[PDB]
Structure 1
């Protein structure tokens, strides 16, 4: 939950980041820990909520 909140705050202060780049960075450059979650949507209006 803290990770999700931190990512939301980080994305709030950014001028229109590329979602595929964020997906690549999250998938590759971060360790896969035990408790996992995923957001799969094709529109940039639901990821924030």
Structure 2
């Protein structure tokens, strides 16, 4: 939950970042830990909520 909140705050202060770049950075450049979650949606209006 802390990771999700931190990512939300970080993305809030960013001028429309590319969602695919964020997806690649999260998938490749981060360790996969035990408790996992995912967000899959085709429009950049539901990802924030």
TM range (shorter): over 0.9
State the TM-score, normalized to the length of structure 1.
Answer: 1.00
Please report the RMSD computed on the Cα atoms of aligned residues, expressed in angstroms: 0.1
Bigger relative CO (Cα 8 Å, ≥ 6 apart): 2
Runs of 4+ deviating beyond 2 Å: none
Q: How many residues align?
A: 49
- Unpaired segments of 5 or more residues in structure 1? none
